[PDB]
Amino acid sequence: GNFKSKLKKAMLSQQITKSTIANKMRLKVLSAREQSLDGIFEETKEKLSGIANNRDEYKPILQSLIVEALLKLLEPKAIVKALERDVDLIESMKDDIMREYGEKAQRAPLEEIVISNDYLNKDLVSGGVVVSNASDKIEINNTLEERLKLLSEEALPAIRLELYGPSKT
Amino acid sequence: YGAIYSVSGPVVIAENMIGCAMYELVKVGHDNLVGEVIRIDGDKATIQVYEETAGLTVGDPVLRTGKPLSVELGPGLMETIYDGIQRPLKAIKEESQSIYIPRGIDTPALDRTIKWQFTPGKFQVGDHISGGDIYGSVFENSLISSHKILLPPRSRGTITWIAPAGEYTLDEKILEVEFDGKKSDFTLYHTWPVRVPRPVTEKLSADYPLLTGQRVLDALFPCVQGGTTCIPGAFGCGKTVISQSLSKYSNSDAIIYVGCGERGNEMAEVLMEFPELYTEMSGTKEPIMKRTTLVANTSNMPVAAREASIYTGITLAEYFRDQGKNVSMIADSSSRWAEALREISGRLGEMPADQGFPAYLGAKLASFYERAGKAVALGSPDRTGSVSIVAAVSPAGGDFSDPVTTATLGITQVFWGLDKKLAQRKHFPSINTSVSYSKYTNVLNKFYDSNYPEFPVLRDRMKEILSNAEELEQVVQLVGKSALSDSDKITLDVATLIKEDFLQQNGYSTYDAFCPIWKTFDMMRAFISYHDEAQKAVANGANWSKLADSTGDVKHAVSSSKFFEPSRGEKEVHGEFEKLLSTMQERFAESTD
Amino acid sequence: KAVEQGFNVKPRLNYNTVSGVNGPLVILEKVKFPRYNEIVNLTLPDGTVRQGQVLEIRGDRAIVQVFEGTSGIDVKKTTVEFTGESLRIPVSEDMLGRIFDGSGRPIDNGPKVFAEDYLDINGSPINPYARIYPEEMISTGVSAIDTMNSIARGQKIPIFSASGLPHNEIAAQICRQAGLVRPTKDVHDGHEENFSIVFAAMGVNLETARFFKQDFEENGSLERTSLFLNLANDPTIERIITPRLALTTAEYLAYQTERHVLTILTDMSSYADALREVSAAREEVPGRRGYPGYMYTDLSTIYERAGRVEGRNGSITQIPILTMPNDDITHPIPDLTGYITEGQIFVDRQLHNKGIYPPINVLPSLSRLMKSAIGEGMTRKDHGDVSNQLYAKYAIGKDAAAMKAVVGEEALSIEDKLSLEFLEKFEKTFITQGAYEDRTVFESLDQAWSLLRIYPKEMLNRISPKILDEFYDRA
Amino acid sequence: KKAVEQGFNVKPRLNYNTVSGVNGPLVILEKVKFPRYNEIVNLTLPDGTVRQGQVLEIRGDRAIVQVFEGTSGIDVKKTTVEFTGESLRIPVSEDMLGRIFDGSGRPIDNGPKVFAEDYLDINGSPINPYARIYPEEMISTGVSAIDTMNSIARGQKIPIFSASGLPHNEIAAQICRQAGLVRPTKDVHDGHEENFSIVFAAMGVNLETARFFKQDFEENGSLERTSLFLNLANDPTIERIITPRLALTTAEYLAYQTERHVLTILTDMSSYADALREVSAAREEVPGRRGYPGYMYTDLSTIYERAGRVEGRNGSITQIPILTMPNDDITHPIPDLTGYITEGQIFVDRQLHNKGIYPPINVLPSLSRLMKSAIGEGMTRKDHGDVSNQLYAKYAIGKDAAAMKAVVGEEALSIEDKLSLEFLEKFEKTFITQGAYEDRTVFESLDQAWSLLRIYPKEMLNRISPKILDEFYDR
Amino acid sequence: EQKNAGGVGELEKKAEAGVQGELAEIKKIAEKKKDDVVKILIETVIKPSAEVHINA
């Protein structure tokens, strides 16, 4: 028994250390894969910020995002918040967005879209706009950073089936 | 901004209250009765008013405060009696000389006029600080010396100015930290919402026993510093003895006694009692009131006060846990708190689930209990605190069918359930050694193996004897003792000896008032070895009637072993028990032949 | 010291806007700034005045419970003048000696009480720090009470009793025999050995009212008692405020005049019934048995106005008789009284059927502060252990009787047979007591010892051996 | 091909600042655009705290969002609630084995979010009754009292009924550490050909036990096969309803979309029922029997019946839903309904636990209805069924003869009963009694059972078939 | 006990060595497929599904 207690302690502690080390290694592999995925997402975010800069091709993207937000909100008068750089673009595309919402949805053309003076944080939002109902109560977020945030959660399985392929299912 | 729109008792439905948050304090009426919202309906906000609502009229202003029900933590609350809302009762009596607590009495929860000595601690100017970081130390009592004042858990930033050593009242600016550009201004006290647990870095495993004194509690169903229990709340003994025992001897560096729903005369007893409990406490005989807040809350006081009484108590206990003090929080009669929840729901109108209790009773008890962990405080320097609930549960008419006890049983690791038969026999303490349990028997083995190696084996033997003999008694009371074998007679008789001399404990005499762990272990050894000697002797020829007659002296010795005055110290009490056990063994060896 | 602040006239808004009336509560509309608890002097079309009380204001509506019932009220002609203040009983030291109707009107031939102060009936919370623990025992004389359930001066201790049991006789006996075990002095003056009872008969049949009146007359207590009678034929919501009226007069008497008062509240089960009626006509969420959810608080406010106070020589003992229905303690009235009141005297039916008086059953009876009004320096030294021993052996005897019923007498050990003999002699000679016996606690303890001496000294195990060796063999 | 490419579309989420009302754990919105019924929301507090909530009811343009993590702090003006477009759905992948998950699906350990293979819906779908197939082979649990003579078959859903304070919550850890197929024990071929896993699900466990589970699965090797879904007692109760659904969805994934078997554990389903009461009363539903909602049986079945083998897919979910006896009575709705849906019961008995036995399995009432499927020549040894039968019979004989030892004396018992007392002592102390960390292979446990039954002569083993005795009794 | 401690240290080192291969494979796969995953994510984010909610 004098040897039995300490030797059982030795075997139990060796098994515990082996199990803990194995768990740490498995979590390390999983966390390394997650860090690689986060690096891919960070490259995607930088690419989105870069794509927002080319205004010539970004204007259709902004108009379509505003149209999608207005269609989802489905209200006849909406307030749109955008960065200071895109205020002129929104003002120029107001009529086109009104007409498109009058055609994308079978509603009448939008009564009035007002660009808010509370500009979005240019240091965080890389692009897009955050539409809001006439009372600024029911607001939809359509910023490119927030869209990528939604996508990074709604398309993890597609990312896996793209990068790795079917494993054992 | 606001205005009353309905009154129905504690429920006062204000209006124009748009913007108020749920559970937010909101002064009510021109008397500024203190109330909190519990339902928001557009403008309106149903407020429970914590007061005698009589006299309120529509149009009475209800001015928000924007802070949840907050307890004023900090030095000064160590020695003081508090009401459920943390009203200092003695301060109320002093400022308002009448014997009545005036409606809507402001009195700060902590004495502002007192000037506490203060030492600067560790952090210096320009040094970053975080929530829970100790930045000072105040000499509160001779028994809570170095009450380490600590930064509020949420706030953080870099220090820009820290006051030097000296004396400061409660409001004095002690520390001025800067976060972003807005530099918060910190004083010697800080509030905290009682409804949210005080955050900790990490909750460890409670593994050092809370020596509660009563023999059956420490031996059969041990409790642990940082655990949780249910003393039965019976009159005379059980609750009454355990409260004083854990107050005086349990080595809990701080204590909070929150008597929610306790009868007024019982509190008047407690208030005249705790100032007089230095009789046998360690150190240099200081009153334990220097070491215990108590949250007095008589039943007559309004419902919401009873509901928030144990929240205030447990937030104070969490505060004293965040300084590394092994605080214990004796929540007396939590069934009264559950009744308060029942009737506040009834006023509120929501559909009750069980016996009229609200459905969320289980979740509410879980939230109140799970703040009982032994945890490291949140900020540097690292320090290990531990709060341990002791929630008396008045059993009412029923035994365990009452939904409060049933919902509690799924949470508390330790449950010293009452035994009606032992109470009717006036067998104190009267806990039921068949339905009680302690999920802390196995975690404590780390402690037992170092100090008392045979303690778990002896406890298992004691339980086995008691259970086998209760089985046997359930038959002999129906048939008779004639047919019992000698081994059966020994099991039954040793069970009677145990139940009368080990489990039973006066709790009032100078001996056995607080049975320390070593004396309890030695008596466990004596009784178990007596049973083993009897069983081994009758395994040989000797019939048991003659053996009992011949070793009545040994039986009386092991029975009167309880009389050993624990103040003699382990050095000689253990010697007495060694002598007793040796004479026991030699007498049984003699009488075997 | 002057109360000259009262010389002001506040004209009272007089409505005619009774929206509707159902059950005992009228409902009012178009009120201008209603107060939550202000009473209302609503006048019926007959010209009579019924004193209501606002129950819950809401905007310009005010549900008003109406004392004296709602029969005869209407909508077209009922006028409800609002007094601006809550119910305030005119209180004085001259009320001592005359009989008040339930709602404070003096049914005695004398005039209205010439009050020197108006106390709110709801009182106010007594600062628990300012409260002082009641330790002076009162010798109620009932041996079943003084020995094993000792009432201490300031304690609350309801006499739980079945319907039809003689709880009234027990309460009258306790009034007749009340007195501290170690009084201040022998003389009536200086010692003040007379409790100035304040008795509140609420929902009692008129025979009980006559019994209490003539029993106070015979004893001479009627010169120092304020009988708040609210009989059976008296209204059913007036029972809400009769206990509050009695307790606020008791508070005036004990705390503000340093007098010693024993406040009986008879038939508080009827109070719970009245509360149920009001809170079931309010469409409230009901509690365990249809009773209001808030019964605990509005019974604590009745009970917890008892006990001594620091700096005042007065004290409010109170013994609220409680007609527990169907004779089960877990009924929500006795179950919610056992919570609030420290201890209870359980008047038990099957003991009464066997002819024992008083039919007090010890095991369910309790006094949660008996432990401090005993021992040395107050009553006999051995009181605390004798009480425990009597309780334990009574329980053992009852268990032995149950076994004897279930299983033949053979299975009973010698201890069980001795316990059966002890229980018989107990119920027949110690619990049993004449209606005027007045057993002082010392001769009660002597009887208890002459009873316990049935057992061998080795068998009185709950008695400390010192008390045994000192008292057992004295004989 | 994989059709999961549909997940690349981005769906912007509306963010309503219109929380008109707040009531208990509910918040009530207005002017909502098509509010889906069951729909997770990220409710933002005024200070910026995100607090998940689940839509509980819709009416026109009003959605009664039920909020996790309490409700305190939710105002009417500044709080903004954002609708995620779909109901709650766990992200699943074949490599969550080894992640201790929180109640709401978020990994609570230091690891990262699961690289989801799929986002399976929580409630899943009922298993096609025609697509079930009968449980066939043993799923060894390492516990001697359970493996031999309360055996569990792949697909059976057998509970562990347990008293309030019994160590059932440690038997769960023991099973989860020691569970496994008998194929590796068979040693005739590769037993790891078809992998095994476990998906533990603790519901309502206090932190002193959740940390015990996490530590005891990390320290031992059981984590690389377990998906420990811990939610605490003070974690939001809606998460307590979610957790069993979470664990069963993970189990359905691992057992059908992949192929590995799984022995899912549901700890303390009584606490899950307690949380279901809160959900039911939140919807203002009237309480059914005992306070539990009348549809208790439906939402218990929709958990239990998500288990069993499947035609085609090789995997199989084995449930062992542990539940605490509310007051140690089978008649309680939760044990009654669980035994009414499950395939048996495995008691843990207070009486044995007070003797210090571990595990305190009470064999006499415990039974596995479809045990006979998992017992035979192919799986376990061929003598397993008769060993179980004989052990149960001799244990019953031992129990009643231990009852008679006190009635007819030890010497008057027949030699069968004397041998039965000896067998019962050795049984309860060596066979049922198992070290907390002692893994006993079913073959080894049967060897102990034989070493225990050879107390009796071959003639007294009437229950065992002679063809088995003639080759197993002597060895 | 000493052998168990040494084996624990050697097992930690061997586990790090074993996980190094898997981490290297993960980095290689990420470096190979990043240029395509980023392109797909950018196309999905920048291309909106302008469509009135069903129940228009």
Curated annotation (Swiss-Prot), chain E:
Disulfide bonds: none annotated. It is found in: Vacuole membrane. V-ATPase is a heteromultimeric enzyme composed of a peripheral catalytic V1 complex (components A to H) attached to an integral membrane V0 proton pore complex (components: a, c, c', c'', d, e, f and VOA1). Subunit of the V1 complex of vacuolar(H+)-ATPase (V-ATPase), a multisubunit enzyme composed of a peripheral complex (V1) that hydrolyzes ATP and a membrane integral complex (V0) that translocates protons. V-ATPase is responsible for acidifying and maintaining the pH of intracellular compartments. Present with 2280 molecules/cell in log phase SD medium. Belongs to the V-ATPase G subunit family. This is V-type proton ATPase subunit G. It comes from Saccharomyces cerevisiae (strain ATCC 204508 / S288c). The lineage of its organism: Eukaryota, Fungi, Dikarya, Ascomycota, Saccharomycotina. The gene is VMA10. The chain holds residues 58 to 113 of 114 of the full protein.
